[PDB]
Design a protein around this ligand. Structure first.
Ligand SMILES: [Zn+2]
Ligand SMILES: [Zn+2]
Ligand SMILES: [Zn+2]
Ligand SMILES: [Zn+2]
Lengths: 193, 114, 191, 113
């Protein structure tokens, strides 16, 4: 077509401005002093140059699509890694909870063993106490029979019973008070965290 | 309701046994659960027991009877690995060395009727 | 009654042997040299002595029953104390388990926040990458249109496009690898 | 099935609040449970949540949506103490200072039916 500024054909090419113009634009101050050629002169050169540029751009676009696929696969791999780490943390906390359960069971069994020992000791002492109470009751019954019956009943072997009562040492029960300890885990792990 | 072997994997159970043996070497770890189809007895809250070595089966049986709150007349069966060997006089160390599981724990079950 | 050893009545009492005997037992070697009285002489004395002994034994038996009740009450109190201590220990372990749950939840939320941040960053980088790929496609289409069309189409403003392709610096996506950590059984060692 | 206030006593819960606030001062403790009679939604495994201070309700809503494994189209209601006040833009610090329970925790419930 023709030029918009002057009206002549656009058959020229400015090496400096890279714009097609007319002959009137070449002499004006707008394109003064530049080097001007014909459009048909540089056609093949710029054609092969742009062909090589197209080759480079095709290769670079292939590389860029490969890069896109790479970043997609990477974010997939990272979500997988995060899932792995979450499962790992949950498993570690479960391990801690299990060993805590075991320690609790150990402490409970220790306390039950201590209770068993204390109870068996107190049961033996209570057996001794009830035996001595029954002995007292038996002696009381014998003295009653002595005081109600015959004179020969009253006097036969009376010194033996008197001496048996003279050695009346009453037995005290076994006891213990607040001489035990059973400490659990102190919240020092909270400071450790 | 999942059993012990269903709540934890095999390697996890072996690691638990190792940690317990490192912490309490003088004690034996025992897992005690109710029978699959026994109804007369309830389910205990606790599942794990650390039993001293010198202790015999009698102390473990009486501990289980006290935890279950049972009178002396009513009896129950305590099977090891699914087969009875309640030689009450034997020490628990021999029971552990003879009937322990592959992972390292000692599994027992309590039942009663039939 | 009569004596089994001699056959005479038992009307005497030996102060030394405390046995009732007969007069033949007094002269024999069994009770020789001992002091012998009549039962009626010491009857009242031994009666009042045994009466006071019965009183004392009643008091002492009451005291012994008190001691029995005391040891019973003590064993009851000790069973109560043991139950209290067991409940206390179980409650402390439950407290530990609760704070363990809270710490686990905190760590899980931290990891989820990290995952969200990483994913949004990678999504922004992927947006940049798809934009640059579309720009490459646009430039390829423009060069095709230049090479197929008119001569003026091929030549007008060609140096601008050439220089734009000269400055083709392809942009890399953001990435990270193995610079994170999760998380120790020191409580096992402390015991 | 027992709720949180039934599994722990009041003084125990107050002590838990105190210890947590001593350990995590920059975070708020929140108890979130499913409704008593909700069937359309599953039960989350985790019950306790520590939410940062500067964070608003939107992040908590997104956390619950991520935990529940829900598609974007279906929405759900998150009530506080059994009554909605979902000013989504407000920071959770104001929600804590306004609607926290007597023990010190912040109780929430999720439903959709
Ligand atoms: Zn012109
Ligand atoms: Zn020019
Ligand atoms: Zn005689
Ligand atoms: Zn004599």
């Amino acid at each position: 077509d023709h030029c918009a500024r002057h009206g002549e054909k656009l058959l020229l090419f400015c090496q400096e401005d890279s714009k097609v113009i007319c002959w009137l634009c070449k002499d004006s101050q707008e394109h003064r002093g530049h080097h001007t050629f014909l459009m048909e002169e540089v056609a093949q050169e710029y054609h092969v140059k742009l062909q090589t540029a197209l080759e480079m751009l095709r290769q670079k676009q292939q590389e860029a699509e490969k890069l896109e696929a790479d970043i997609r696969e990477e974010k997939a791999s990272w979500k997988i890694q995060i899932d792995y780490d979450k499962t790992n943390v949950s498993a570690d906390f479960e391990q801690l909870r299990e060993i805590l359960d075991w320690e609790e069971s150990n402490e409970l069994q220790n306390l039950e063993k201590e209770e068993e020992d204390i109870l068996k000791s107190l049961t033996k002492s209570e057996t001794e106490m009830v035996q001595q109470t029954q002995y007292m009751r038996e002696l009381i019954s014998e003295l009653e029979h002595r005081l109600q019956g015959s004179m020969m009943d009253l006097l036969q072997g009376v010194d033996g019973i008197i001496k048996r009562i003279e050695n009346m040492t009453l037995k005290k029960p076994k006891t213990f008070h607040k001489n035990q300890r059973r400490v659990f885990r102190a919240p020092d792990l909270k400071g450790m965290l | 309701e999942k059993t012990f072997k269903q709540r934890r994997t095999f390697e996890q159970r072996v690691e638990d046994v190792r940690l317990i043996r490192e912490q309490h070497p003088t004690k034996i770890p025992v897992i005690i659960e109710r029978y699959k189809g026994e109804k007369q007895l309830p389910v205990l809250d606790k599942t794990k027991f650390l039993v001293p070595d010198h202790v015999n089966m009698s102390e473990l049986i009486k501990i289980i009877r006290r935890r279950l709150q049972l009178n002396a007349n009513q009896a129950f069966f305590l099977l090891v690995n699914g087969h009875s060997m309640v030689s009450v006089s034997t020490p628990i160390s021999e029971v552990y060395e003879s009937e322990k599981d592959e992972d390292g724990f000692l599994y027992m079950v309590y039942a009663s009727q039939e």
